[PDB]
Design a protein around this ligand. Sequence first.
Ligand SMILES: [Cl-]
Ligand SMILES: [Cl-]
Ligand SMILES: [Mg+2]
Ligand SMILES: [Mg+2]
Lengths: 391, 391
Amino acid sequence: SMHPQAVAAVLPAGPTPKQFCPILERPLISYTLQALERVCWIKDIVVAVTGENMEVMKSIIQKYQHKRISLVEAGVTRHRSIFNGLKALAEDQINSKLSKPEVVIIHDAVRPFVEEGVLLKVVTAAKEHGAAGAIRPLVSTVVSPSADGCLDYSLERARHRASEMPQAFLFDVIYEAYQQCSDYDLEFGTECLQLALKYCCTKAKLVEGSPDLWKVTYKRDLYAAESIIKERISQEICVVMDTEEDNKHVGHLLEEVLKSELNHVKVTSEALDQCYNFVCVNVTTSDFQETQKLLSMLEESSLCILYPVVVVSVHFLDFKLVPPSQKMENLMQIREFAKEVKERNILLYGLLISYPQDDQKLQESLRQGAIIIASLIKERNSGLIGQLLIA
Amino acid sequence: SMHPQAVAAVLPAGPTPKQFCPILERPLISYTLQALERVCWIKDIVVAVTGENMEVMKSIIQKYQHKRISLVEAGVTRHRSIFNGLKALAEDQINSKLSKPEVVIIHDAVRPFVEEGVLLKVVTAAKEHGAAGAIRPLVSTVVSPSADGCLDYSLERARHRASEMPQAFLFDVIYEAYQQCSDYDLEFGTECLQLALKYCCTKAKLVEGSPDLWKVTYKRDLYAAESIIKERISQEICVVMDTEEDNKHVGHLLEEVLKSELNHVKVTSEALDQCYNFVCVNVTTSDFQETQKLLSMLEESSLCILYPVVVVSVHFLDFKLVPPSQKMENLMQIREFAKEVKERNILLYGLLISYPQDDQKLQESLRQGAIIIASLIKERNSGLIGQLLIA
Ligand SMILES: [Cl-]
Ligand SMILES: [Cl-]
Ligand SMILES: [Mg+2]
Ligand SMILES: [Mg+2]
């Protein structure tokens, strides 16, 4: 209850920039906006986009239900885009629609893994100093080429750092800096903290940042970001079951084995909240009554808007190696359901567990079940939807 | 037939460095060595490792069958490790075991995506200039902190570049540079090209490099590298079949649909060479005679040493929705085979295609088959081995 007061954010969102490149069919900028919106004390988030993209952005705001977002037109350069964002926040006009912050954050649309910690640190350092920025060590040596493309000099790696986002400023300082800024610097400047230093004699505080702060620039960064996203949504599973005592027991049985086999995963069970993996468990039918309920409940929801939701429909059934033909015929309705719910961003898979078995055989099947489920969750791959797997 | 003559390479292999971190259970350094060994004209590859790791490295050389590798002891710093590598190549002693190169390449063990192109360019520039290095543009602004951790100054992004590997030198130049180098510079220097400039007045040629040249430093770089590796081994598939005319036709049928559905994939068919994906096709039995032959042929091979090999055993069978119980019982031997060959780094999956069907139903099953196969290839995930999938 001690959150910074009067804070807003500005994102310039103007190889080619990757802010609209999809990850799991969702544009990268949407993940960044989500990460910023989760920080309750950032009152307004001002995003600069170009005219050609203004409609894509608005559609993105609607589709993913982003809150506290005000759009402004980007300039041709990054400093111009940021200035327009600050203008919109200045509350110094008849036209102004937004409270003037004390502290403003600058972030980039292609840096989706920002969290409340580093933000708090840069906001706090900026109150005390006027300006602040996240830094990282250099991995590569920096060099200066001559006109003919030969080594002129090398810089001492230990005396330099890479400037990263987020940055934060006392609003009046940075706004005043932009108002004094030469048009040359607006065109060719890359670094807001250098503006504050040159035009307001404000020496920014450099805060140490995590490896997560990097900017998505290349294809390989998109790969890395996809993986981090998929890992983070793999850490929670909800096992769902009927009130029937048979179903509750196998459901809880599976819950327990998922907990013990998948270390560092939060597993819960609900009868029949930011969870994207569901394990629906059934003994008492050769059908999908429980799974159908769960799907209809998710087809409505906005869980499916934000990330692909994985649903594993699990059936405990009596059989030696293969279940009887007629029961297997019923289970194959999974294919049809999977095809339908794929359209709503749900990935539906089936898993058969032989029940009952001898103790050790059943233990092994439960472990295999857990591994299979973890695998389907990890990969989140649409290619295997509708399959009936066996533990 | 115009390859550079008298070339050798030196790799200093001494968060914590990631050269022994596994990707697909194979250490990162092994992928780099493979990439360098593929360049035929690099006569010797000298790798510096620390004493504690000398045995791991030797084991790695044996396990993955690396050629042309000579090991030397790493120093405590990077310049010391490189000097020892050059010493071993100098051929200026009774103890010398290696031809003296005209040009030597320096590379890093944690940069596995180096290819003949950039190598040729830096070797060629180094003949003409004495020294040469790959460069990249800067993504982040570089700054200098003051003692109290505040912004001192920012560097102009457009006048600087990030120095990357590979680098190459006329041997005598760089060897002479190391022989004149102060112990301070051996301790604190990060940049071989700066050595050549300071101690031999050699201005290195800066060659433009690809985004692939980056160094694996963080967990997120390991993710990216894994993805790139898996993508590159996904571009070739071998469909394997009996001489039986029935099997040849369904095998070739599937080959053709894989070609058309998987654009930019090289697909070939062999009867029953750097391919890690096999599709074994069978109509004429409810058994795995053809697949067993293929597995035994791979259990011997060194394909499985370098990358996990994916094998999809495909059965075309008559059935409406579910195949008859007794035939399904036979197909479940797949589970047992998969468990066994997993130990030899082979990932075995099963796929059932209903045959015959009406034209359009069969077309659809073939397409789904292709998507399933592509998915299993893409992910290369051990969790789903032994499953019988249905197209
Ligand atoms: Cl402006
Ligand atoms: Cl030495
Ligand atoms: Mg600018
Ligand atoms: Mg050194």
